[PDB]
Amino acid sequence: LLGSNTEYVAPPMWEIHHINSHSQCYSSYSRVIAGTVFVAYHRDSYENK
């Protein structure tokens, strides 16, 4: 067993609009920092369901 970072993040506004008009979120966070965009997925290698 090793570490466990956990960070709390605001969704993007397009997603806010999705959330509260469909009762569902996308299984991916994406934020750009410096140059490139970074991205996380729910279970590994998942799609954007």
Partner 1 sequence: TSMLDEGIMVVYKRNIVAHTFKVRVYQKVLTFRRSYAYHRTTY
* Among the listed residues 2, 13, 33, 37, the single contact to partner 1 using CB under 8 A: 2
Do residues 19 and 38 lie in contact, with contact meaning Cβ atoms separated by under 8 Å?
no
Residue 3 contacts partner 1 per CB under 8 A: yes
Q: Which of 16, 19, 25, 39 binds ligand NAG (CB under 6 A)?
A: 39
- Based on the shown chain and the rule CB under 6 A, indicate whether residue 42 belongs to the binding site for ligand NAG: no
Is 1 or 10 the residue whose CB approaches partner 1 more closely? 1
